[PDB]
Design a binder for these strands. Structure first.
Ligand SMILES: [Mg+2]
Ligand SMILES: [Mg+2]
Lengths: 618, 620, 623
RNA sequence: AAUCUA
């Protein structure tokens, strides 16, 4: 057991008592909250030609106050699993194509110490003490700002009064592997200092975990094969396809489909030559060698020539155009276009009672939104000309919706008369769809008449690094503004950051490298601030201020007087008449007093239909 | 952009603005309702040896687009109304795909906006036609879809929501070029056959106007169709070789009138397992699947040649004769109503269960709204267990579609203001075709056996079709309409024309046309032919039972209200209704408070009422 | 159309009327309750290398067939009672299928009618037997199934619903011809062993009469069995050659008492890899599965021969010795109650949480809550995470295994749970380590956690599993010798003949589930399996009593607290908000449950006293 | 999916 001190917090880490059959197990305890994290990795190679890592963070009695539920994973559990997955996936060795599952069990929760941060550290310790190949321990802390003071691992009470909710995962040598933040439109300088404080605290956790690894003997397994392309067949692919790929990536009038088809034309014209040259080569190895050669050729152009595949410099945006009031019956609407990415954002007002539901146990599972504000994000298969199932929601769609929701959350007004639901549908996808959902969402919010404090613009910052194979240190790098899909795919990170013209509201740094220096992170934040200014200026031309009032076809809430003698007929047997009227019409009726009822009509026409029934009944 | 005028209604078609990445995309707008339909088809052939076409119609709100909470909940992802609309769109566009187009195709419908006036389901069908027409996906001529209603004796094209609630007909017609009919799906309030037939002719006329507008939009756009990598149809030289190997043996099998479903299928499979192995030797390089489909083509042609040339079915009937129909009722004492309907080798078990009126409404508004209350307090659950075909399967879109059709058939004769919620359960114990239509006949018997005072008995039948078509002109030379088709005649036929009604009208219709459209003359004669069969079936059913029972069974449910004083309300109801909720789960009764002093109690059985009564008395 | 008389009950059995397309069909009727059971078996062999038998018992209504649920089946899914009934039917008919029958088989039960008096679950087992007997599916002799209850000290066959609610024993017996018990499943209210044993003897006598009636129906129908395309059993000459290679190596592994679960399995797999290559070159044309199953047969025979010949288990103990048992309580402060039970290499984490009495009522009370309400407000939730076996698996929802094991452990602890407890008792048993008996360890750990939580259970409950290794005549098929094993490991359950799980207090039996893999076993073997487990259970209760012998005098300080706060009538509208909006908002944001109990009284339930502070401030500020 | 906690 090792105790790590973090200011006024203490992190108790232990292993060797529970779940000893697993490849790796660890118990991380803070206060009275204990999380057991387990890592299991299969020994046989996976049929899939990639890393089949899955993280399942499960909560027992998932509610505020620990109400024991006792079928579906909660959205909070899904988001926590994605944060853990992003913290540990970069540190896995390349070619580790083995099925791996990390499971988090909430042994105890005291309602004071948040178990989500403990689960990330537990995943690090379980992997560190296991035989699973994994490069270096990571440390995860949460940084908040309470009354201008930075606090490490704030309690539940402190988090409720914090202007920042930032989670930092750090690697050895003060590297950063994961950033996930949501701020109440705080200054960039305050945001930058919180990352500096967080990275310092993760180093203390890392050296504590390293002490635990030193005490208990850890022998790493030897995988039967690491599925990385052979260097001698990678460099032969370079000879065949470098010139053709170079012309394609300097062909500045390509679009998304044309560039992809041109690359695939070279791939089909080179993969067959690779097969004859190396008959014994793995069929997947042939595929990955072309991906390796294409990726490095793509990045070499950016590093050497400071020019991108579509002919713009490292700091300029794509073509941005937007419009509002697309359709008459929508309460609010906006079509935001950025390059070849198109998002349709719709604002629908709802009754405040639609935020709560029946099944109060289920209601506490997903909670109640503080501002009665939610964002539903959809990524239809036709956005990328693909076939896919539309039932349910993906993990990626849930995560993208949460990021866009917390980007717009700081500017959403308090105590709005209606529940605000924003539906962002990605009609066309070429990268930064979630950030486009924030810009289009704010445009649609202003079009619907919601008096938001400021317009919110999001942007994605890419990164291309030259890393020496001798030590793994970064010597040169380029930061790209408003990256395309191919730049995210061939890049090192997807630094999605949103905010108003005077602050930052959300951040999600999806770093594919085993860690980046804090210097790069600071420069990416500054670079994104300038790009955010340009996007906001374009957005303000379409609409700069919220409309003076909501659309005339919007919802209306009015009270109806029902006498105590006639109320039996009004509600019927067990509320049958009220529920029947709420099904044939969208009107929601909720009793307020013994002689009055509150009627919410989604449209003025629905109000007329309901009013006819109320008079006829009474 | 092209505008099509359909009487007093206007249709707006546009493309090139939204979802430019999809193979095809279109926005269809009527009034303030706009629907975007996209069509994506893969380039590589699908591993499955058939057409993998899936239509997903999605709604962003419920109750005429007035429930914004609907698509917040990914749970309860799809409703029955969405499934039925997806099946309608699928039936309208599936027959127009080229034969052998084994490519994964998905058609997705997004409701951009709905005004609560114009119905988006018909616009979705037209949007699917435009998206496919403008795309590079190989697809035949444009399909126009309209809805025809009868309001105050007048035929209305694309009636609004208000007009639909007052119309005696809800008919959806999909038309191909040259006034062909691709899909028919109607629910009628027991209207006359002549009135029904006129609406089909009116609808076909209106669909041609839509096809004209879509054709102009296609002309303006530079639409170029892709060349598929391979169309998976058997080679003509292989089909012709299979013909001389198995035509005589298949002919003897289909002229043997002593075969049942299993014996005929086994005899056909015996020839298949004898000819396919010989096909491999003659064509070593042939695609293995091509061999399976070659025998299917030969068997289908031999099967149809007998009906056309000899006017005789495979079981010895003529074109108009029905199968043996036997009925039974009151088999089980505890069931409120029951009926066992047998038609040939098709056996359907129908059960009527009476429930409380409040049982039809869920505990939350959102789920209640998305799956709205039924027009009457009546629903039909349709089950197709795997053992009905001696198969193994998990315990469905097809069962939902069949149940909706059987519910549509029986809905017009269901009485109004019935004290209980009528729930009809149809279980296909044995399947040999027209199981859904047998569910309508058996359901009528079970409703009469349970004591439900239906206005008239309802019988349904399926009409087959066997055509000889010109290989060059594509025109129908001669055709045979078949009465009460078997399963094999559906499989080898051109359409499955399910139509139900009383002795004096038509209540439901669903034409599953597998041809690229059929002439309106064939449809009119199929309706007339089904009228003759419907009368004969109703005559047999009347022998088993001709009128509803004078009263419900003595074991049936009963409602009665008990008095609870205000002082005893706290003890009786309990903490937050806990005591009431415990009772309604133990004894099976349902207690609903109707006023301050009295509670209404519904008990499924008189014994269940006895159990709840004794427990209630000791508390009070 | 054959009627079987069982005392004052009748079993009407018929066929040839409904669902004639199925390979087998039968209608079994008792009183006014009728059940149709169908059996469909494919003719083409399954691509899998085992037996794909699935039983789906489906109901069309809940609460004795009062509230219909078939229409909502798409949304409500399969109820817990249906899953448990399917497992009982599966256990009754699975052992009688011939070895090597690798063909997809589905047995479907359709409840034609229920009168609320005769339970259809027993008729479904008999209907499965008749449907298989009259079908062409290769199946062994008919199986009769009865339920035995003890009402007022007398034994009742197939008790009604009214009688079952007054019975101290809910025992279901499935019997084979010649009085061979094939399935046992029971839940007793801490009854004596002598009374329990007599009920089994009575039940087997009644199942013989049903078998006689089914045999009469089969004879008059004229049933002809199909000939399977192939029975996938290893060739006798292939097995013999495998026994010439792996016999000595496997014998050394199983006589090496220093092994644990992982090392022993790794040692066996090392021999498996060595032998399979020699088998492949010796029999190149052999089925690749046949090579695999040949080693399994040889390894099973070597493993069992040591127990029979030498009376010693693979870990060195004797037939009656228990593995090491360690117990802990109060491992976490915030848990209302917790325990850590270890038995060899089987570790179970048991947690007790108290909720309000209204947490046992679902959302759709009229229809969803009808799927089940706990009698004593007590339930056990059993989880088997994939890392207990060091495996990877899907981890949302419960499979049939976890529902069955949780039901068994819940029934073991149910008799000792007190009555009129102020809170809803919820026990969660998570298997952290698995080496053969986790469901029984959930009963022991659950008893410890209940005492640690402060619940005054009548007595401690201990569960044990009894294995069985038999020597069977190749020609006659009669058992000539047998050994009963106490506290079996996973390897002994896998290579054994039965998984006899029984639990109870020091004075009686509370639960039983006999997972017999043989096609029936003599009643005397079952008789002394109960007796042997009585000795084993006594020793386990001695170890558990050392850790904790009596429940704690009071519940933990951080436990739930419930009391009522008065809300004035003039401001009740503000307190509840629009349509109870404020109450639901407070419940989601704090966790407290507020339920109106009078015209001015609201009962507040708080999971923790700290959360009650938050709620009390909220009520104070919102008046 | 279903056996299978080897
Ligand atoms: Mg077992
Ligand atoms: Mg077992």
């Amino acid at each position: 057991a090792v105790a790590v001190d973090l200011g006024n917090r203490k992190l108790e880490i232990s292993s060797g008592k529970l779940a000893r059959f697993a490849d790796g197990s660890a118990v991380v305890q803070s206060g009275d909250t204990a999380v057991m994290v387990t890592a299991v990795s299969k020994t046989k190679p996976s049929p899939s030609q990639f890393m089949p890592l899955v993280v399942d963070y499960r909560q027992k009695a998932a509610a505020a106050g620990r109400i024991p539920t006792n079928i579906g994973t909660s959205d909070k559990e899904i988001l926590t699993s994605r944060i853990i997955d992003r913290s540990i996936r970069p540190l896995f060795p390349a070619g580790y194509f083995y099925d791996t599952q990390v499971l988090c069990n909430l042994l105890a929760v005291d309602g004071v110490n948040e178990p989500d941060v403990l689960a990330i550290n537990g995943a690090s310790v379980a992997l560190s003490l296991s035989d699973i190949p994994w490069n270096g321990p990571v440390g995860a802390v949460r940084i908040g700002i309470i009354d201008g003071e930075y606090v490490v691992n704030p309690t539940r009470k402190e988090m409720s009064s914090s202007t920042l909710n930032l989670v930092v995962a750090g690697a050895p040598k003060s590297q950063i592997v994961m950033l996930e933040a949501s701020a109440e439109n705080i200054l960039q300088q305050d945001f930058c200092h919180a990352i500096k404080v967080g990275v310092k605290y993760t180093q203390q956790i890392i050296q504590g975990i390293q002490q635990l690894v030193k005490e208990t003997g850890v022998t790493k397994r030897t995988p039967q094969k690491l599925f990385t392309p052979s260097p001698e067949i990678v460099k032969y692919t370079h000879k065949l396809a470098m010139e053709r790929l170079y012309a394609v990536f300097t062909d500045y009038e390509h679009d998304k489909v044309s560039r992809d088809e041109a690359v695939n034309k070279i791939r089909l014209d080179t993969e067959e030559q690779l097969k004859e040259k190396f008959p014994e080569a793995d069929p997947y190895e042939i595929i990955e060698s072309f991906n390796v050669v294409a990726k490095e050729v793509f990045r070499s152009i950016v590093l050497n020539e400071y020019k991108r595949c579509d002919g713009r410099d490292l700091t300029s945006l794509r073509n941005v155009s937007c419009e509002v009031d697309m359709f008459k019956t929508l309460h609010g609407s906006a079509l935001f276009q950025r390059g070849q990415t198109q998002v349709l954002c719709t604002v629908t007002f709802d009754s405040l009672e639609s935020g709560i539901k029946s099944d109060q146990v289920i209601t506490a599972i997903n909670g109640i939104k503080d501002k009665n504000f939610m964002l539903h994000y959809e990524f239809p298969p036709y956005a990328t000309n693909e076939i896919g199932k539309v039932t349910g929601l993906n993990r990626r769609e849930l995560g993208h919706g949460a990021l866009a929701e917390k980007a717009l959350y700081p500017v959403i007004p308090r105590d709005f008369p209606f529940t605000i639901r924003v539906t962002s549908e990605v009609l066309e996808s070429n990268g930064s769809s979630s950030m486009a959902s924030a810009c289009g969402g704010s445009l649609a919010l202003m079009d619907s008449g919601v008096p938001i404090s400021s317009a919110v613009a999001g942007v994605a910052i890419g990164l291309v690094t030259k890393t020496d194979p001798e030590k793994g240190e970064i010597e040169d790098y380029r930061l790209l503004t408003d990256i395309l899909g191919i730049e995210d795919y061939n890049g090192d990170m997807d630094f999605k950051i949103a905010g108003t013209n005077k602050g930052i509201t959300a951040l999600q740094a999806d770093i594919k490298l085993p860690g980046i220096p804090i210097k790069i992170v600071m420069e990416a934040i500054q670079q994104a601030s300038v790009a955010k200014k340009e996007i906001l200026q374009i957005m303000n031309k379409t609409i700069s201020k919220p409309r003076a009032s909501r659309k005339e076809n919007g919802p209306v809430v009015e009270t109806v007087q029902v006498p105590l003698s006639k109320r039996a007929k009004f509600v019927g047997p067990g509320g049958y008449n009220l529920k029947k009227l709420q099904a044939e019409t969208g009107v929601t009726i909720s009793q307020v007093d013994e002689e009055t009822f509150s009627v919410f009509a989604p449209t003025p026409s629905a109000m007329h239909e309901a009013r006819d029934f109320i008079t006829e009944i009474c």
